[PDB]
Design a protein around this ligand. Structure first.
Ligand SMILES: [Fe+3]
Ligand SMILES: [Zn+2]
Ligand SMILES: [Zn+2]
Ligand SMILES: [Zn+2]
Lengths: 1181, 62, 445
């Protein structure tokens, strides 16, 4: 392969910077003040290295690299398993060890070594006997909690790997009894009913079919404390729920059966026929009148997204209702992975409930999405309080006319890519008529009539432009500008009519009204009124006649005014008349022939069909496909703190209070008894919790204790004794319960780093790691001074929502061209040299764009790192940052909460939104989607200096969300599978739009539109991607959602209902009922039910009593006893419920329920202490 | 004679196109066979008799 | 949930049942009196007052049950827990208090008894004669212990007492004529499983449409009829109830109940009390229905509304009537006392002298300053419901009857595996306060 010498240089520069950071990290770590004498984050460049460094076995990288090129990705796993069992990698011992190692390695290879399933999801592998039927050996797999967040596709492959391993080792099947199957059914049903709603709910027949054919056992430890009826089942050691096993069996082999059967047939495994069988068994009249019928029969509305409504989260459009979101096939610069494109104008007019990064609950393509501004598509159409109608297509007009808006007749447009349709396998909804379809028809007509060749969206030859201009009698500059930006440059209405009457193409979509949104009888009445009582000013362009003004009195118009509103026609009301202005009178009167042929209603016909039957200029359906959506989970750009904030990993016990303040304990001179580890100096004999001797200056050795005789042994003698007490023959431990004096330690640290002005220093109550090695207090002092926080492994993290980006302009991120050339950028995406800030530059795979809050936090982190290097380690400073613009060109690590591997990035700019912009490959490398997910970023040097494997929790799940290995190069072939469906074409062709009306599956035209998968393997997968829609700015619009500015629920519901009232495509009475059914009534009923079974708690102590003490005081403290659930908790949502009942048309069931709830609350507290809806209800009946 | 042959050819050109064609196109295509004056006279006579009409100035349709 | 479209239903407005001319009822004077009723007694930071109310409730319960316990002649030399230190080793004493915890060891039982003055730990050895009773006592019940004390801090007991029914009773005077009474409960009007035909046949029976001489004589001597709770199915008791309702409006439910109870003859008096699915208080004790919601059952000329619970005197005998929601607490604690035999749990409730002792389980208790659920005076007959199974037992002279239901098996019941016994009716004799006949209408269902 021949790379353009640019990608190789890019990767070489990245490696140079990584080595530069590692040099100082290694020089600092070798002084001896830290748990290890070397850096604890190994670096790898491909999947083989990650698999070797995560689960082993040693020497697997070479074999993996050979076999992947020889056979492929899938079969190399089987070959590695075969080699492992044969003993080519050493002697492991028992067969359980071989089985466990083989399963872990195979799963790591198949999952590409990123998801933490092989390390933490699988707990044990054991060989068991069928003691109930035949006493034959069978293989069992044990699962843990972390498997519940490992993805559906990773749970299913574990069963396949276990089956292959048990087949290879020479074992028998797992033969269960009826009690086992009944227990599994009961467990699944109980889990769904009690703890969490499963994403896929299988029927008991499916569960029995699955349990009767799986050759391995799927068990695990108890995760939830919910008892099950069936008990004492042989071979199962617990009587509580086993969440991991049931979630695997429900969301793997069942939910993802198609992927599993694909893998099975590709690999060649035998014995999985039942899954294949289950998969295969589970699966006179006008033109537009018939298309609507076929559309409804083949695609039906879905209301799964609107089932639940939370107060403060409005509903924007009803399922498949005109007036909602229009559908436009395309991909913007900053959308496409799972992200929608939305005009900023409709963000404002919905009371700013939508900001950049807000998640939507979509209906048609998938389940969720993220919003990103696109300023080229259309915006809302509004009706003012004086009767005027406007089209809002820009930010400023929306900012100006917001206060005068009475109704939102149309929301606007949504840009959804074709790759989403391919990924989710959704039938193609018929396409609306837009600019690019029209421009393709235009160029095709020119080619067919005058033999002139032109190409949209590019630069054409001058001779062809001149010839076309001569044949069309227009300015060549206008043609050149229209053919390269057909979405921002539009012709006047007379030119559109001329094009339609000369070339034969339909009318321009900009001047086409929503003709199919009204019935033909209304148009007939409007025609009669316009013919009878209207004044029209006519004009002339070249022979052609077009209207210029319409003035008709309001009394004669009558109810026909609603037809104009439903047609989306701008007009004004003044002095008792309605006036239609220049560009829209022609749009209204040209499709009707300037009142030269009479409009008559005809059965089995639509408005556009009647227009096209008798007219010279034809039309197309501007609006035929609509999509609904709902709000959920606003954007996040905050920091990351432990539940009580922590700044040092030093145990303090209860000597610091609730806040766990070490400084407070030092001030009072308290003595704390905590569980900690000590070190011993070889020469002087000092004992303490530090690593370097305060007197000698040498490194100390760990002390091992015996829990019975309490004898101390250094590390050397412990290794000599094989970590066992000679007198007791018991296992030694590295920690013991000891008493420490915080004052002396704090004073020593303060004198060590010359930091004195600290008011608070927060630690932890007790350590979770097995070693229980504490952190130096100087790091905590510096962290407190610089106001930064710490995580469970010693690193500092920042969490933000992720959004895609492929192309950018230097002016959006505040970076000059000179800095870009210093970074390495030299050309734009069309090949021209980089000289201006307005050009568009393609983005490199590992370059990221941060937010401004991220910059503000990382500036503090950089100051902390510099202070640490200067004072604690005695080394030169590294960052030297005074403003956040000084971090441009440095490195970070990206991580996801369910992974054990990170990826290195570079900072090139900042934006003003609350999202994290990066290349789609970057997010795919974290096994992540751009539909409302949040990831983490941390500075590289901080991670290298401060991360340690000794601080990690001992329990399963402690290695999740930790940088165990980081990747330095990005390869699209080993990132994820969703990004392989992303379309990278400049513009969709005519075949797509023509095949859209036939309701074809997206798999029938994958060869027409180029995708990422077609470039895999070749050097062209790193550069050359394209986009369909442009955007002026990627951070234009509101930044914070309105949901964060509201505290009370009454205000939330009031604003939500106002938004529902404003929008035509939302029925406010339906919203009022859903709120009561889903958020308000359940809370009131639950609180009223829990008030009479509550507990009582003392204030001084925290003892819980199941019934009140008789004397009214705590038996021990003597303090006051308070309630747990109060009267204020059963009445907070009652006024809002009464208002909903009294102002909105809800059903009688809900009214009576709320009235009885009010009566019940009034009645319970009886012995302790004319216009209303309840009184009218009880008086009417 | 030449006019009789030319009108049929112009009718043939406009027939297959099935839409309005600019005068420059017919002038360039029929220019080699016939001089400009004869083409203009033929267009005027065809308009006078009436089988074609002129929607926009300079564009001719059946 | 999801409420669907409107539906059309009937409210039994054309159902007329007439008296049979072949039966002439006997003329007997009527002696009924409502001895006890909740409405007879007349009982800033809110949390303070609520805590005070609960404390006063439990103090009142302790005082009442102590006054009951002290009537036992074998109970003497009672000492206060706070004054236990004065007790000598040789001297034996008695302590009376509530029960906080009951834990089982390999050598006996260990309790925690709390009084108004202190809390002490009690040890009952496994060889004690009264050991099985201590293994079945529910928490929040007033018990008594007898034994010695230790300076170590453990009270060593050798006897255990409960407030029970006395073993001797006086023979009441006879009656000039014989009168019967009918006990029913759990009608559940408005449900899809409500047995209309069985109830119509029951109404035809009370009007003298029979085929046997014994039934002819029984129907002519019935003067009372008692209904205890769950007269309607209510609305919003559990999610998905709309799809299981024929009449989804509570006003029309009470209208249908009144229309269907207007065919009871004039010479029969009815006593109706609230339940758990009715328009009443959300926690026991319940004063009465809501007048504005349950008006149609107030206008019947031969019906008087009672409370949950209430005591009714009929010709000199006391009838204790409650819905009986406390049977679920006793079943969940003591092993072996399953459903389908609701008599033994009732015996336990009677011999603890409290209708719902446990607090914090599956029975709600309202914050009242005084405890009205203590059985102050020993009754003659106790009636309950809420379990949907018929049973009858006798304990030391009193009769315990659980009226069946008129609602067939539902999906919720067959999920939890309980089989109801629909359409079973007890007939009691006032002179003896015993069930003498059970009527069966399950064939028509
Ligand atoms: Fe009931
Ligand atoms: Zn030393
Ligand atoms: Zn030892
Ligand atoms: Zn206390």
């Amino acid at each position: 392969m021949e790379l353009p010498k640019e990608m190789e240089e890019y990767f070489e520069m990245l490696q140079r910077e990584i080595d530069k950071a590692y040099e100082i990290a290694k020089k600092a770590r070798a002084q001896g003040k830290d748990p290890s004498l070397d850096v604890e984050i190994p670096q790898a460049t491909d999947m083989a290295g990650r698999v070797e460094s995560l689960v082993g076995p040693p020497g697997v990288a070479k074999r993996i690299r050979e076999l992947v090129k020889e056979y492929g990705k899938e079969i190399a796993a089987l070959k590695i398993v075969d080699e492992i069992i044969e003993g080519k990698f050493g002697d492991l011992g028992s067969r359980e060890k071989y089985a466990e190692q083989a399963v872990r390695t195979a799963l790591a290879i198949l999952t590409e070594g990123i998801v933490s399933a092989p390390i933490e999801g699988i707990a044990n592998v054991k060989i068991k006997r069928n003691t109930w039927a035949d006493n034959s050996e069978y293989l069992a797999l044990y699962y843990a909690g972390p498997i519940r967040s490992s993805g559906g596709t990773a749970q299913a492959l574990s069963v396949l790997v276990g089956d292959y391993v048990r087949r290879k080792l020479g074992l028998d099947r797992f033969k269960p009894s009826e009690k086992h199957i009944e227990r599994m059914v009961e467990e699944v049903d109980l889990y769904h009913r009690a703890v969490t709603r499963l994403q896929y709910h299988p029927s008991p027949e499916e569960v029995r079919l699955a349990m009767r054919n799986i050759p391995i056992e799927i068990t695990g430890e108890a995760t939830d404390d919910v008892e099950v009826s069936h008990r004492d089942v042989p071979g199962v050691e617990t009587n509580q729920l086993r969440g991991g096993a049931i979630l695997v069996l429900a969301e793997g082999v069942l939910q993802k059966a198609k992927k599993l059967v694909k893998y099975i047939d590709k690999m060649g495994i035998e014995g999985w026929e039942w899954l294949k069988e289950f998969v295969e068994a589970k699966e006179d009249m006008g033109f537009y009148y018939s298309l609507y019928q076929k559309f409804k029969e083949e695609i039906a509305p879905s209301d799964k997204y609107a089932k639940e409504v939370i107060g403060g989260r409005p509903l924007f459009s009803d399922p498949s209702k005109p007036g909602g979101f229009r559908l436009r096939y395309g991909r913007s610069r900053a959308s496409g992975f799972a992200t929608w494109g939305i005009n900023p104008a409709t963000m404002i007019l919905v009371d700013e409930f939508l900001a950049i990064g807000t998640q939507l609950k979509t209906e048609r393509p998938g389940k969720g999405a993220v919003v990103t501004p696109v300023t080229t598509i259309e915006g809302p159409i509004v009706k003012l309080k004086d009767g005027s109608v406007l089209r809002v297509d820009d930010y400023n007009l929306a900012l100006k006319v917001r206060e005068d808006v009475e109704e939102i007749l149309y929301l606007g447009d949504a840009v959804i890519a074709f790759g989403d349709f391919v990924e989710n396998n959704q039938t193609l909804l018929p396409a609306n008529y837009c600019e690019e379809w029209w421009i393709l028809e235009f160029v095709k007509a020119l080619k067919e009539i005058y033999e002139v060749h032109l190409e949209p969206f590019t630069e054409n030859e001058e001779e062809s432009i001149e010839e076309a201009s001569d044949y069309l009698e227009i300015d060549p500059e206008f043609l050149k500008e229209m053919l390269r930006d057909p979405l921002r440059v539009k012709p006047p209405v007379e030119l559109a009519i001329h094009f339609s009457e000369v070339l034969g193409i339909p009318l321009h979509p900009y001047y086409t009204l929503y003709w199919n949104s009204v019935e033909p009888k209304d148009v007939e009445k409007l025609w009669r009124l316009l013919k009878n009582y209207a004044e029209i000013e006519w004009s002339n362009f070249r022979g052609i006649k077009f209207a210029k003004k319409i003035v008709i009195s309001q009394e004669k118009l009558g109810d026909s005014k609603r037809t104009l509103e439903l047609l989306g026609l701008p007009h004004t009301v003044r002095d008792g008349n309605v006036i239609v202005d220049y560009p829209w009178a022609a749009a209204l009167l040209t499709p009707l022939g300037n009142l030269n042929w009479e409009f008559m209603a005809k059965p089995l016909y639509a408005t556009i069909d009647i227009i096209n039957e008798n007219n010279e200029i034809k039309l197309r359906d501007r609006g035929i496909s609509w999509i609904g959506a709902r709000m959920g989970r606003p954007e996040k750009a905050k920091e990351r703190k432990m539940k009580p904030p922590v700044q040092v990993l030093f145990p303090i016990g209860l000597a610091g209070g609730s806040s766990r303040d070490i400084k407070k304990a030092a001030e009072e001179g308290k003595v704390a008894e905590v569980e900690i580890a000590f070190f011993k100096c070889p020469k002087c004999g000092h004992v303490g919790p530090e690593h370097l001797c305060p007197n000698c200056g040498t490194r100390k050795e760990l002390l091992w204790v015996c829990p019975r005789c309490n004898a101390e042994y250094p590390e050397s003698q412990a290794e000599g004794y094989n970590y066992t007490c000679p007198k007791c023959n018991v296992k030694l431990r590295p920690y013991a319960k000891r008493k420490i004096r915080p004052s002396e330690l704090l004073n020593r640290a303060m004198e060590n780093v010359k930091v004195y002005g600290v008011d608070k220093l927060k630690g932890v109550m007790g350590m979770t790691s097995g070693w229980k090695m504490p952190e130096p207090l100087e790091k905590g002092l510096l962290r407190a001074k610089n106001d930064v926080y710490v995580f469970k492994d010693g690193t500092i993290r920042f969490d933000a929502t992720d959004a895609p980006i492929t192309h950018f302009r230097p002016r959006e991120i505040g970076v000059s061209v000179e800095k870009l050339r210093e970074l390495g950028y030299t050309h734009d995406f069309e090949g021209k040299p980089l000289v201006s800030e307005d050009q568009i530059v393609e983005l490199k795979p590992q370059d990221i764009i941060l937010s401004k809050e991220a910059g503000r936090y990382l500036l503090k982190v950089a100051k902390f790192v510099d202070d640490l290097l200067e004072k604690f380690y005695g080394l030169p400073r590294f960052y030297n940052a005074e403003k956040m613009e000084d971090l441009i060109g440095h490195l970070v690590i990206g991580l996801a909460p369910h992974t054990s591997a990170g990826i290195v990035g570079r900072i090139i700019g900042f934006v003003d939104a609350l999202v994290g912009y990066a290349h789609p490959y970057f997010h795919a490398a974290k096994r992540r989607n751009c539909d409302g997910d949040e990831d983490a970023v941390m500075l590289l040097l901080d991670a290298l200096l401060n991360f340690s494997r000794y601080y990690l929790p001992e329990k399963r799940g402690g290695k999740m969300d930790a940088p165990l290995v980081i990747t330095t190069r990005l390869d699209p072939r080993e990132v994820d599978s969703e990004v392989h469906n992303m379309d990278i074409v400049r513009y969709y062709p005519l075949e797509f739009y023509e095949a859209t009306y036939e309701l074809k599956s997206p798999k029938e035209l994958v060869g027409v539109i180029e995708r990422v998968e077609d470039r895999l393997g070749k050097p062209e997968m790193y550069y050359g991607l394209k986009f369909t829609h442009d955007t002026d700015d990627i951070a234009l619009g509101p930044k914070m959602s309105l949901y964060k500015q509201l505290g009370d629920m009454e205000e939330k519901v009031r604003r939500q209902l106002e938004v529902a009232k404003r929008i035509r495509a939302v029925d406010e009475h339906g919203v009022a009922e859903k709120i009561l059914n889903s958020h308000l009534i359940p809370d009131l009923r639950g609180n009223l039910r829990s008030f009479t079974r509550q507990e009582f708690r003392c204030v001084k102590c925290n003892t819980k009593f199941r019934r009140p003490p008789l004397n009214g005081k705590c038996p021990v403290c003597g303090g006051k006893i308070v309630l747990t659930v109060s009267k204020g908790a059963i009445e907070k949502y009652l006024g809002t419920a009464k208002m909903l009942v009294t102002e909105y048309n809800v059903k009688n069931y809900t009214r009576q329920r709320i009235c009885l709830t009010e009566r019940d609350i009034d009645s319970l507290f009886e012995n302790v202490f004319p216009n209303d809806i309840c009184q009218r209800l009880v008086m009417a009946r | 004679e030449l006019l009789e042959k030319a009108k049929e050819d112009i009718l043939n050109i406009l027939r297959q196109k099935r839409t309005a064609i600019s005068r420059k196109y017919i002038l360039k295509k029929l220019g080699d066979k016939y001089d400009e004056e004869t083409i203009d006279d033929a267009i005027t006579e065809l308009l006078a008799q009436g089988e074609i009409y002129e929607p926009e100035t300079g564009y001719y349709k059946l | 949930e999801e409420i669907g479209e409107e539906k059309e239903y009937s409210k039994y407005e054309d159902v007329v049942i007439e008296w049979n001319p072949s039966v002439t009822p006997v003329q007997i004077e009527k002696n009924y009196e409502v001895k006890f009723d909740v409405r007879q007694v007349k009982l800033g930071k809110e949390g303070e007052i609520i805590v005070e109310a609960y404390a006063s409730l439990f103090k009142s319960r302790l005082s009442k049950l102590k006054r009951i316990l002290r009537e036992n002649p074998e109970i003497s030399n009672v000492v206060d827990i706070g004054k236990l230190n004065y007790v000598s080793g040789d001297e034996e004493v008695t302590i009376i208090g509530l029960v906080n915890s009951k834990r089982e060891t390999n050598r006996g039982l260990i309790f925690e008894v709390e009084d108004k003055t202190g809390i002490v730990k009690v040890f009952l050895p496994k060889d004690s004669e009264d050991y099985r009773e201590a293994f079945k006592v529910l928490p929040d019940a007033v018990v008594a212990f007898k034994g010695f004390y230790s300076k170590k801090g453990i009270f060593f007991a050798n006897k255990f007492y409960l407030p029970d029914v006395p073993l001797y009773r006086k023979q009441k005077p006879p009656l000039e004529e014989k009168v019967y009474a009918i006990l029913i409960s759990d009608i559940h009007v408005g449900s899809r499983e409500f047995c209309e035909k069985a109830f119509l046949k029951f109404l035809e029976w009370l009007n003298g449409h029979v085929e046997s001489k014994e039934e002819e004589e029984i129907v002519s001597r019935v003067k009372y009829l008692i209904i205890a709770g769950d007269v309607v199915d209510g609305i919003g008791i559990y999610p998905g109830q709309y799809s299981d309702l024929v009449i989804p409006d509570i006003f029309d439910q009470y209208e249908a109940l009144a229309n269907l109870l207007a065919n009871v003859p004039e010479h029969i008096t009815m006593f109706i009390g609230p339940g758990n699915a009715d328009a009443a208080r959300p926690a026991i004790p319940q004063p009465e229905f809501y007048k504005e919601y349950a008006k149609p059952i107030y206008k019947l000329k031969n019906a008087i509304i009672i409370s949950n619970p209430a005591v009714i005197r009929l010709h000199g005998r006391d009838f204790l009537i409650a819905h009986g929601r406390g049977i679920e607490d006793v079943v969940s604690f003591v092993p072996g006392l399953t459903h389908h035999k609701p008599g033994l749990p009732m015996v336990e409730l009677l011999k603890m002298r409290h209708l719902a002792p446990t607090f914090g389980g599956k029975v709600p208790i309202a914050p009242d300053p005084e405890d009205l659920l203590v059985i102050e005076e020993v009754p003659d007959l106790v009636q309950m419901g809420h379990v949907h199974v018929y049973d009858a037992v006798v304990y030391r002279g009193v009769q315990l009857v659980n009226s069946a239901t008129w609602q067939a098996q539902t999906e919720f019941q067959k999920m939890v595996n309980i089989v109801p016994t629909p359409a079973k009716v007890p007939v009691v004799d006032v002179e003896s306060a015993r069930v003498v006949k059970v009527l069966d209408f399950s064939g028509w269902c």
